[PDB]
Enzyme design. Structure first.
Site, PDB file in Angstrom:
ATOM      1  N   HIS A 259       1.029  -1.226   0.114  1.00  0.00           N
ATOM      2  CA  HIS A 259      -0.059  -0.096  -0.024  1.00  0.00           C
ATOM      3  C   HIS A 259       0.906   1.229  -0.049  1.00  0.00           C
ATOM      4  O   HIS A 259       0.794   2.073   0.787  1.00  0.00           O
ATOM      5  CB  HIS A 259      -1.043  -0.092   1.205  1.00  0.00           C
ATOM      6  CG  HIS A 259      -2.045  -1.012   0.940  1.00  0.00           C
ATOM      7  ND1 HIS A 259      -2.317  -2.227   1.462  1.00  0.00           N
ATOM      8  CD2 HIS A 259      -3.304  -0.862   0.421  1.00  0.00           C
ATOM      9  CE1 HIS A 259      -3.213  -2.667   1.244  1.00  0.00           C
ATOM     10  NE2 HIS A 259      -4.037  -1.883   0.273  1.00  0.00           N
TER      11      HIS A 259
ATOM     12  N   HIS B 104       1.916   1.536  -5.600  1.00  0.00           N
ATOM     13  CA  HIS B 104       0.573   1.109  -5.646  1.00  0.00           C
ATOM     14  C   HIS B 104      -0.361   2.310  -6.346  1.00  0.00           C
ATOM     15  O   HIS B 104      -0.941   2.269  -7.319  1.00  0.00           O
ATOM     16  CB  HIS B 104       0.015   0.401  -4.340  1.00  0.00           C
ATOM     17  CG  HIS B 104      -1.575   0.445  -4.442  1.00  0.00           C
ATOM     18  ND1 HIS B 104      -2.164  -0.622  -5.271  1.00  0.00           N
ATOM     19  CD2 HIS B 104      -2.584   0.675  -3.992  1.00  0.00           C
ATOM     20  CE1 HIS B 104      -3.478  -0.567  -5.157  1.00  0.00           C
ATOM     21  NE2 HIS B 104      -3.836   0.299  -4.192  1.00  0.00           N
TER      22      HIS B 104
ATOM     23  N   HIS C  86      -5.639   7.569  -3.314  1.00  0.00           N
ATOM     24  CA  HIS C  86      -6.667   6.654  -2.691  1.00  0.00           C
ATOM     25  C   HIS C  86      -6.451   5.879  -1.615  1.00  0.00           C
ATOM     26  O   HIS C  86      -7.281   5.613  -0.840  1.00  0.00           O
ATOM     27  CB  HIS C  86      -7.329   5.714  -3.924  1.00  0.00           C
ATOM     28  CG  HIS C  86      -6.753   4.444  -4.104  1.00  0.00           C
ATOM     29  ND1 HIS C  86      -5.560   4.514  -4.771  1.00  0.00           N
ATOM     30  CD2 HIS C  86      -6.958   3.509  -3.648  1.00  0.00           C
ATOM     31  CE1 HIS C  86      -5.077   3.233  -4.778  1.00  0.00           C
ATOM     32  NE2 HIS C  86      -5.788   2.423  -4.021  1.00  0.00           N
ATOM     33  N   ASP C  87      -5.154   5.549  -1.228  1.00  0.00           N
ATOM     34  CA  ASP C  87      -4.565   4.920  -0.112  1.00  0.00           C
ATOM     35  C   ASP C  87      -3.533   5.759   0.539  1.00  0.00           C
ATOM     36  O   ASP C  87      -2.581   5.037   1.541  1.00  0.00           O
ATOM     37  CB  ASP C  87      -3.776   3.366  -0.564  1.00  0.00           C
ATOM     38  CG  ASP C  87      -4.640   2.412  -0.728  1.00  0.00           C
ATOM     39  OD1 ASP C  87      -5.695   2.342  -0.079  1.00  0.00           O
ATOM     40  OD2 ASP C  87      -4.598   1.532  -1.578  1.00  0.00           O
TER      41      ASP C  87
ATOM     42  N   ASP D 210      -8.101  -0.631  -8.516  1.00  0.00           N
ATOM     43  CA  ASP D 210      -7.384  -0.874  -7.238  1.00  0.00           C
ATOM     44  C   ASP D 210      -6.876  -2.416  -7.136  1.00  0.00           C
ATOM     45  O   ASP D 210      -6.085  -2.565  -6.623  1.00  0.00           O
ATOM     46  CB  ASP D 210      -8.421  -0.564  -6.242  1.00  0.00           C
ATOM     47  CG  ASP D 210      -7.701  -0.531  -4.910  1.00  0.00           C
ATOM     48  OD1 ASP D 210      -6.394  -0.320  -4.757  1.00  0.00           O
ATOM     49  OD2 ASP D 210      -8.496  -0.468  -3.777  1.00  0.00           O
TER      50      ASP D 210
ATOM     51  N   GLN E 260      -6.232 -17.595  -3.619  1.00  0.00           N
ATOM     52  CA  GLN E 260      -6.229 -16.771  -4.733  1.00  0.00           C
ATOM     53  C   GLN E 260      -7.205 -16.961  -5.592  1.00  0.00           C
ATOM     54  O   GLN E 260      -8.037 -16.411  -6.264  1.00  0.00           O
ATOM     55  CB  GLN E 260      -4.842 -16.810  -5.466  1.00  0.00           C
ATOM     56  CG  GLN E 260      -3.714 -16.030  -4.754  1.00  0.00           C
ATOM     57  CD  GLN E 260      -3.968 -14.552  -4.868  1.00  0.00           C
ATOM     58  OE1 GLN E 260      -3.672 -14.062  -5.805  1.00  0.00           O
ATOM     59  NE2 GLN E 260      -4.296 -14.049  -3.873  1.00  0.00           N
TER      60      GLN E 260
END
Ligand code: K79
Ligand code: CL
Ligand code: MG
Ligand code: ZN
Length: 313
Positions: free
Chosen positions: A68, A72, A106-107, A217, A269
């Protein structure tokens, strides 16, 4: 006004494709972002001096966590760039300005922990924001940086245009709360199937922009397999650190976050691709047909994980 950013030939061509990787040279990422704003928006929509000072303050407020992080941020902005450039006519001037900035921010100030961990820890942020905790914080940090002197890249908008773009950014960043994705996609699925979906209805646009944010994202699952595979390590490094912190609060973490259950990652996953990623890019492809390459790349990677489980890698 006559100053374009230009990329080397290989980047100039590959940056237009959904599966582009921004590379390991940190000092090129700001230039990559400006390039995308100029081509996506125009050389005029931002004062280069103000934009550069915004970008470097945003970078400064991303932390040195495994996933993050600043990379990213720029990776998620690139996916949004590729969606806007393959859907030229569907998005307003303001939406194009708002959404690349939304994705970069956004993060902001992520510590590499889920909203769940903040709540069980009893972090002050969980008291201030009872839902979408980190995402309200991300928007708060975006507004704080816009209000630093010489950082207001939107200052040239009218008062109502300014309120609209900050509203676009707020909804876009809130929508990156994966807990909200499930209902958003279900509703979009129904509206697409009943034929009630209407991009002139603002509440409908909001929902579609929400889904684009989830798609951007999650875009590490839409890369070529070696990128996807190596990003997964960064993703799980954060999960396992969170699991460790859970064990410290005397809570057994979910297996996803337990580093003792490292064997179960390939199966976990599949679950994620089948439960989250494939549904996301399917509904996005139905609404925006030119984003099909993300669905195709996602399915390829699902198949690569199936090959990991079956011992073939
Ligand atoms: O590879 C993955 C495995 C599991 N989860 C995940 C995250 C969170 C809730 C979760 O459970 C459920 F789906 F059921 F909600 C699963 N996410 C990813 C992933 C791929 C690309 N980005 N991210 C991602 C990473 C980290 C992150 F915080 C968010 C991400 F989307
Ligand atoms: Cl163009
Ligand atoms: Mg987030
Ligand atoms: Zn993110």
């Amino acid at each position: 006004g006559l100053m374009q950013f230009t990329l080397p030939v290989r980047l100039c061509k590959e940056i237009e494709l959904f599966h582009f990787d921004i590379g390991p040279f940190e000092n090129m990422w700001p230039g990559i972002f400006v390039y995308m704003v100029h081509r996506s928006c125009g050389t005029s929509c931002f004062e280069l001096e103000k934009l550069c000072r915004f970008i470097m303050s945003v970078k400064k407020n991303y932390r040195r966590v495994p996933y993050h992080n600043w990379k990213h941020a720029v990776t998620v902005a690139h996916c949004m760039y590729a969606i806007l450039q393959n859907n030229h006519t569907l998005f307003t001037d303001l939406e194009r300005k708002g959404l690349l900035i939304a994705c970069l921010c956004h993060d902001l100030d992520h510590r590499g922990f889920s909203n769940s961990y903040l709540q069980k820890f009893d972090h002050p942020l969980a008291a201030l924001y009872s839902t979408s905790t980190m995402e309200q914080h991300h928007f708060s940090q975006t507004v704080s940086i816009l209000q630093l002197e010489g950082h207001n890249i939107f200052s040239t908008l009218s008062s109502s245009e300014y309120e609209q773009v900050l509203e676009i950014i707020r909804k876009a960043i809130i929508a990156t709360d994966l807990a909200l994705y499930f209902g958003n996609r279900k509703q979009l699925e129904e509206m697409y199937q009943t034929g009630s979906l209407n991009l002139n209805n603002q509440s409908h646009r909001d929902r579609v922009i929400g889904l684009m944010m989830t798609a951007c994202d999650l875009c590490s699952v839409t890369k070529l397999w070696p990128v996807t595979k190596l990003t997964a390590n960064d993703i799980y490094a954060e999960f396992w650190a969170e699991g460790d912190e859970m064990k410290k609060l005397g809570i057994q973490p979910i297996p996803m976050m337990d580093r003792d259950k490292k064997d179960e990652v390939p199966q976990g996953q599949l679950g994620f691709y089948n439960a989250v990623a494939i549904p996301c890019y399917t509904t996005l492809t139905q609404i925006l047909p030119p984003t099909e390459p993300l669905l195709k790349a996602c399915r390829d990677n699902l198949s690569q994980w199936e090959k990991v489980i079956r011992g073939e890698e």
